[PDB]
Structure formats: structure tokens, C-alpha cells
Symmetry: D3
Amino acid sequence: NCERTFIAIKPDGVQRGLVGEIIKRFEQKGFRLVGLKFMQASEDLLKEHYVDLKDRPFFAGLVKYMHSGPVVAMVWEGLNVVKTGRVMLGESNPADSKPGTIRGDFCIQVGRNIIHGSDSVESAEKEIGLWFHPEELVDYTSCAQNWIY
Amino acid sequence: NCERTFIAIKPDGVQRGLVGEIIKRFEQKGFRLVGLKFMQASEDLLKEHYVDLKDRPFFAGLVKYMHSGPVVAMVWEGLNVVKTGRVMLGESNPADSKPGTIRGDFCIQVGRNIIHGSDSVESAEKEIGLWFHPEELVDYTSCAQNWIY
Amino acid sequence: NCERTFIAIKPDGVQRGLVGEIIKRFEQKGFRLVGLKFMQASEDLLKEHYVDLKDRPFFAGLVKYMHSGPVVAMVWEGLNVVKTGRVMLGESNPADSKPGTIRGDFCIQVGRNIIHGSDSVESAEKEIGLWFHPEELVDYTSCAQNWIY
Amino acid sequence: NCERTFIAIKPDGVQRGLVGEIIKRFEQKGFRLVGLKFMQASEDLLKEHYVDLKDRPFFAGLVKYMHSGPVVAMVWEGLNVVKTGRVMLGESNPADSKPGTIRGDFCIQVGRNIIHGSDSVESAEKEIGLWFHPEELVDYTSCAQNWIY
Amino acid sequence: NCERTFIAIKPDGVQRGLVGEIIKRFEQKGFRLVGLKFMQASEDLLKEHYVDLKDRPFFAGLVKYMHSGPVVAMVWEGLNVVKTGRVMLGESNPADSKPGTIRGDFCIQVGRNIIHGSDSVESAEKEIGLWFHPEELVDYTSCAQNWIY
Amino acid sequence: NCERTFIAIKPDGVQRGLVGEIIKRFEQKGFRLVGLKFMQASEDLLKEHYVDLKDRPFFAGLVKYMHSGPVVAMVWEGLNVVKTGRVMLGESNPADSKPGTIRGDFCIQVGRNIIHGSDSVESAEKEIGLWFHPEELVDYTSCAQNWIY
């Protein structure tokens, strides 16, 4: 119930005016927003984040594209939030994401996926600790918690 | 073509302001609204409704929760409405409902699934007879029936 | 704060699938739904309701049109709800209602204004007592009252 | 990346005011609109289009229904547009289309499928050449192409 | 009731993906779409259209901007359609258009006002005859005319 | 064209899930998001912000309410952004805000106006300097600037 996930809206999602539509989807699903911040991602930070896929031919291109514009990084809290976030985001390859998701609604290519989300409950914490300072994680109580859980 | 289903918006979905968004989904799908009323469900009525799942550990909790606030009960009429309503509503367990449905959009927990729908064409008639009086079921002809069918 | 208004969606707005969109507008404004009921309006009831405008050339036409299909009658509760309801509904004459309202969004003619609302806090009570039985007015407490008032 | 598809909104989809909601879906997905026109389809044109399903019991009914009102015909250009358009449109049989698609959101019957789309990259070109003149196909560059691809 | 207006979505509104959101606004207001086509406006056509404002310092800039991309030209038919369309579009100067209109929602600058509309019932006919051939104007009967007028 | 405004979503609008709907409105209007951050406002910060209305009977209540939950603070950049933001937000008193604005859509009481905006181009700079560090103000170029201006 205190489980948290890390979602990052990419510069493709920022110059396409997609920040509000995704936040509304998460809020109306019912997850509690814990952290929200708007940076220009540094290359060292991106390499630390994507060391998992570093040994890929497209890693350099991914880093260069991601350090082109600003990113919207958010932390969402709730029950099964990590898995529900991937379900809502859809599959990365656009030839596989169904309509009704986020990628399946706003994505055409795989080299730009507009949105990124944590895969596991360990990667989620690793990304939150890497991106957000512990003091920038608001812990409040929503007025709809009794009507969610 | 005169098939009818029973949909009930629970107090979880009433205090979250979800009555309009579901009615729009059904109306834009194209089903004809036959009955609509707004009550506080009595415990005897709830027990008669949920006698199917009475022999479950969570039956008492379900009855106590559903007799807390007001429910929005409606009857929709159309072709294959009973099955199409379940398809639109989605699966009860939130870890199985896909985005684009109602539960997959607004639900996080199984204990409060915000919406309830008839499973079979016999349970639908049973629930309609149990909840609505036969005089509160409007039988009109929509202006778009010639195009719907 | 316990002030209540009476809104009635006409059959013209019922065959156009406008029930959900108006309910969403009221709910997202933040008023608390107290009564909701779906009937076929009887001519005697309509005459008792419109005795105010009975001495008009279009009274008979209004009654005949209103007793053609079903009406959605709702009661909304909140602060300054009667005046805010007229503000949201807009002006009756379509050549005067601004965009962003309900009539200014979905209305073209004055003979079918899709929606009707109480004018004063006395007519509101007169209409509520005339249409709804006192037992069909649910008195619950919303979870967002602390974040409305 | 220059791949093109043919989509046709049927007179049932025009009578129900569904033209804007589909165009917005395609635009927000990110495809580039190339052709758009609003006509009354002739029976010879429809027979040439549906010669594939001519040897079916419902061919005459399909042609007669389609030559009743006006059709909106559009051409969309993008990567994997032919397959992605079919995915967004959903399955023809309403008892198989999932919510979140176009048919799964606005369709109840199979005899009227509100929308029609090309199945393969060859049928797409055959339909574009059949329905549009080569001079009515705009070739511009969008301001968001650098992000989409 | 057979009154018609001319609306043109400009290339600024075409590369911003605003075609669907405006068509849906007009359709939900309830006007009947008569003509729709997607062209690249020629400079001679634009000069004939804007001869009224030809003797202005910004006429050449207006023509050069308008002949840059493709425009969407539509004809809408209804009661008081010419005046209602201007009301819905809003005022040209962005520092005067209120929220809820089209310009007041999607416009920041006067040089790119996304949309253009006929001012009077004579200019409307002058623009329709200038832009559309008489054979490209569909004259059908909508299924909701009884509930518009 | 480099004018900037300060908008703050209050905890009243944060616990009601209104963050996405406002961001969409600003983005679709066309203003460029420069800064975005999510904090719990400190009482000293609030007193420095509201020293203008400090000599009012409701100043203490305002500060106590504002330091109850988290606020969403953002900076928007564009042409006439300071005045356009107030126009979009609407009047503070709910009995004066028209539908189509933000307050006129989601506000019922003046004590909780969900949103706050800078009044003048000097107060905007004062609030930006007071709330955001100069390093947290991203200066990128959108892909739609060539069309907006």
C-alpha cells in the first residue's frame, strides 16, 4: 500500500503537450502523487540509470536523445503501483501496444517511447533514490483513501 | 434486441464522482437507458441480491460496505447488452482489468470495485425485478435506433 | 450550505445522449447529488409545474413536447447551488448563451432547451416537493466536503 | 514512413456525430492527414470497392446502406499506418472488439460498422487511387515529425 | 434553418492537430455538416477571399502565411449558424477571447488565429461559392433534426 | 514573448485530482512550461508570499490552510501570459467566475480557490524568485513555436 513507482515523461512527451493527459490518467486511476519535478537530465545521470541497457547498440543514441530536452519525473504511490504502471503504459514496441494505454494512444515509434516506467519494485526504489532527494517526497493523506482501499 | 442488463454504481463510485463518466460510456456505446434511480440499499435487499456469494468470508463485509452510502442503479437495453456490459466493465480483480474499461480505469482494489453488473440474462432479469418496480421502466424509442440497428 | 436546486433533463436532451455530460459538469463543479430519478412526466404534473408560464401562447406546445419522452430529474445540494446552476446552464435563448455553458454548448433552438433549472430558492423547494417524495432524497456526506468548504 | 492507409466513416458514423472523435484519435496517435473529402458514394464506386466481398449474401444490403448517406473518406500517412489503423479501429464483429478502440467504443451491430479501413498495403493503395484524385493528396511536413520519428 | 456558414481551419491549426476538436464542437452544438475538403489554398484564391482586407499592411504576410500549408474548409448548416459560429470561434484578438471558445482555448497570437469564419450571411455565400463547387455540398437529413428543431 | 507567470495549485486542488486538467489547459492554450515542482509550502515562505494580504482578517487562516498539504508550483512562459493566466483562471469569488474557466468549473467557495496566479508582471517575477531557484528553470524551444508565433 506504500509501494511506489518511478515514471519519467520524456522530451518527446514534453514537446507534444502530453504531461497533463498522463497525470490525469494516473490520478483518475487513483494513485497518490508523491514526487513531481522538472529537470534537464544530465548524461552521467542517464548513464547511471541505463547501465542495464548500456551494452546495446542504441544506448548512445538513447542517451543523446534523452539529454536533448527536459524530462518530467514523477513518483506514484499505491497498491501494486509498479505493475499497474506498466499495464497502463503499455508495451514499448508500438506494434504491440493496444488502444486505451498511453503508448498505444500516443506512440508510433520505438526509438521514442515518450514515457518510461520502472519494471520491478527494486528498480523503482533504485530509480527514486537516484533521481529524487529524500526530502522532495511528500507524504500526505488523500481524502479518497477510504474510497480506494 | 430487447435484452436488458442491470448496472449498479456503488457508494465507492458515488463519492468519487464517477456517475457521469460511466453513463457517458454506455450512452456513447449506444445502449438505451430504460431505468435510473438513486437509493440507499437496504441490508435485506443486499442479502437477497448477494445470496449467490453469501457463503463467502467477505459477504458480511460486502453487505456492510454497500449499505454505507447511496447506490445508483440503472437498466440498459440493447443487443447483447448483458455480455457487452461486462466487457466494458472489465474484470473484477484490478490486477487483471485492461486499460480502456471502467474498472481498469478507475479501480485499484477488489474490495471496492465501484461498479457491479449482471452476469447472465437470467440474473439480469432477477436483479431488475428485485430492484425496480415494473412501472419505473421507461419504454421509448430513440431517434438513432434506425442507425444503431 | 444545505441549499438545494432542481434540474430536469428534457427528452430532447435524453434522446441526444446528454445525461452523462451534464452530471459530470455538476459533479466536477462539486455539488452533492441528493436525488436522481427517471420518469415519464405526466401532463397534470407538467401543468402544475408550468402554471407560472401557463398564460403564454406556447404553453400547450411545451406541455405536449415535454410529455413525449422521459425526463431525468435531479436534485443538487451545495452553497449558492440555485444561482450557480443557472449560471452553468446559461441563458434560455440560444442567441444569448455563451460557450462553456450547457445550453451554449448543446442548444440551437429555444423550443427545445434540453435542460430546465429552478430560478429561485423558493421555486426550487416547490419543484422538489412536487416531483420527488421526501423519502427519495438521500442525505449522505461526501469525502470531498473538507476540500470544498 | 511514407506508408498510407484509407479510412472511410460511414453514413451511420456521420449521422451520430462521430467524425471529430475519430480524427482526434488518429491525430493524437500521431499520423499525418494527407487527404480529406466529404461526398455521397455512388453505387458503381461502392461495387468497385467491395468486389472483394461481392459474392456474399449481404453485398446488396451493404451497397444499399452505404449509398444512403454521405461518407467521410480520409488518407493517413505514417509508419505501419495500415496495421495500426486496423488495431485502433478494432474487430468488425462487436462481440469481439475490446474497449478503447473505435468499434469497441461506438459499435453495437455488425451490419453497420461506423468506420471502414484498408486491410493491407496493397488494398490501401487500390482504395486511395480509386477514391481520391492524385491532385487531392497534400504532401506537407508537420512541425512534430522530428519528435515522432 | 437552411442558413449556411463557411469555416476554414488554417495551417497553424492543422499542424497543431486541432481539426478534430473543432469538428466535434460544431457537431455537439448540433449543426449539420454540408461540405468538407482538404486543399492547399492558392494565392489567387486567397487574394479573392481577402480583397476586403487587401488594403492593410499585413495582407501580404497573411497571404504568404496562409499559402504555406494546407487548410481545412467546411460548410455548416443550421439556424443562426453564421452568428453562432462567430460566437463559438470567439474574438480574433487573443487578449479579448474568453475561455470556452476556440480562439480563447487554443490561440495566443493574432497573426495565427488557427481558424477563420464568415462574418455575415452574404460573405458566407460569397465564400461558399468561391471555395466549394455546388456539386460538393451534400444535402441530407440528420436523424437528430427532430431533437434540434 | 519571454514573459513568465507563476501558478500554484493548492492542496485543495491537489487532493481533488485537478493537477492534470489545469496543465492540459495551459499546454493546449500553448504556453511553454518552464518550471514545475511539488513541495510542502513552509509558513515563513507563505507569509513572505502573502505579505500583501497580511493585514486581513483571514490571513492566518489562509496560511494555516496552505501549510496543510502540498502545493504544485509551476512557471509558464509566453506572450501576455500573466494576463492570459488570470483570464483562464477566472475571478476569485465563485459567484463571479463564468463557466469555461478553471475556478468557474471546479470552485464553489472563496476560502478554497484551488488555484493561485500572479497578478502583475512584477509580482510574477517576485514569486518566481521567491519560490524557484534560478537553476530549476528549463529554457528549451518547443516544436510548435514557429506556428504559435
